[PDB]
């Protein structure tokens, strides 16, 4: 670290009116009470009303940025229809250097912390000046908060129980 901090790239309020945002899950819990990762958001349709999205951001802060999102893999289809109302998956997270799309399906898996479902997590740096775009037909984890930063040098990592 030379600088590292957390800010609110897209506030939960007012970034996503047209998708219901307040879904969480129960393995992700707090003192035996359900929850979800602070930095991030679910999105689903407004009472089964999924519109599809295109959003973006580019740096104004002039510091480097770190960004995170997710790609939804249900364990069953009735979720996929009920939330997002498309068997089609197509997402496009785009930048200048990096860009990638995602078109997954339902892939059943075994219980792991009582979860067959999966969301594969995906991430990138973003420098000053460069833009990110999201586009999607759903199946997403969206950034609420993102990590502003500078680089660092030479510091590192330990595993230790001392």
């Amino acid at each position, epitope marked *: 670290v030379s600088s590292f901090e957390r800010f609110e790239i897209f506030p939960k309020e007012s970034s996503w009116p047209n998708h219901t945002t307040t879904g969480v899950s*129960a393995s992700c*819990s707090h003192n*035996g*009470e359900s929850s*979800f990762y602070k930095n991030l958001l679910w999105l689903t349709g407004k*009472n*089964g*009303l999924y519109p599809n999205l295109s959003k973006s951001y580019a740096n104004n802060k002039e510091k480097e940025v770190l960004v995170l999102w997710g790609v939804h893999h249900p364990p069953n289809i009735g979720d996929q229809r009920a939330l997002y109302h498309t068997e089609n998956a197509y997402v496009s997270v785009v930048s200048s250097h990096y860009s990638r799309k995602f078109t997954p399906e339902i892939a059943k898996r075994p*219980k792991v912390r009582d979860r067959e479902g999966r969301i594969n997590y995906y991430w990138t740096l973003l420098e000053p000046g460069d833009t990110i775009i999201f586009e999607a037909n759903g199946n997403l984890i969206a950034p609420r908060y993102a990590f502003a930063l500078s680089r660092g040098f030479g510091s590192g990592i330990i595993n230790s129980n001392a």
Partner: single-chain antibody, 236 residues
């Protein structure tokens, strides 16, 4: 959340007849937003229809609806004397506040929850209820406590998401207080400052799958399942 208007709150019709019922609100309200119930007096509610079209489990094919925006509608293809019942109109606010139509009597002319503590207290008094769970994961679902005066329109006393965002009505709030326990698989409702408006039968209600979990469990934005309820009364 918005005031509703059922149409009609009672009707009297013969066998071998349809029955058109229109529950409409102030504003236009998005369509997979309502769910439709029945109840026999003496029985708990039962689930029928959701989102103005689609149909629940363990069913004939006769109760079928339509409508969108401001005006939602459940129609009925055939009437029968086994249907002698009050039907209800229960909608999930975007303000997460369930709102209720006031029951619609059809007159025909010629796994589980368990509640705990219902009974009497004195007015202005203090008492608690509990519920307890059986054979599921009380972790997941968004829970609701509900009330019903006898042969009356319901009122939604309270609900809470498992993330902890409460929702009450502005009159009821403060005088009631909830608390949830998942490792214990049980629910609690301590209650104080109690008047004759609480003279009614209450229900513990298991609602909506939050986002994510293993199962062969779909969700709707309707209820999941009811409880058998219990009476509560103030008197002297």
């Amino acid at each position: 959340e918005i005031v509703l208007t059922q149409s009609p709150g009672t009707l009297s019709l013969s066998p071998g007849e349809r029955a058109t019922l229109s529950c409409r609100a102030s504003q236009s309200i998005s369509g997979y937003y309502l769910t439709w119930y029945q109840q026999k007096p003496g029985q708990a509610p039962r689930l029928l229809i959701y989102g103005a079209s689609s149909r629940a489990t363990g069913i004939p094919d006769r109760f079928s609806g339509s409508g969108s925006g401001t005006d939602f509608t459940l129609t009925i293809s055939r009437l029968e004397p086994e249907d002698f019942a009050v039907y209800y109109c229960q909608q999930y606010g975007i303000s997460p506040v369930i709102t209720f139509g006031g029951g619609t009597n059809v007159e025909i002319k010629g796994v589980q929850l368990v509640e705990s503590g219902g009974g009497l207290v004195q007015p202005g008094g203090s008492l608690r209820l509990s519920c307890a769970a059986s054979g599921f994961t009380f972790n997941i679902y968004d829970m609701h406590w509900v009330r019903q005066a006898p042969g009356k329109g319901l009122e939604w006393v309270s609900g809470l998401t498992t993330g902890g965002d409460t929702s009450y009505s502005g009159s009821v709030r403060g005088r009631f207080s909830i608390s949830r326990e998942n490792a214990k698989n049980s629910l609690y409702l301590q209650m104080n400052n109690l008047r004759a408006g609480d003279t009614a039968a209450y229900f513990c209600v298991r609602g909506v799958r939050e986002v994510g979990a293993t199962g062969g469990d779909p969700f709707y934005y309707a209820m999941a399942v009811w409880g058998q309820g219990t009476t509560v009364t103030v008197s002297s």
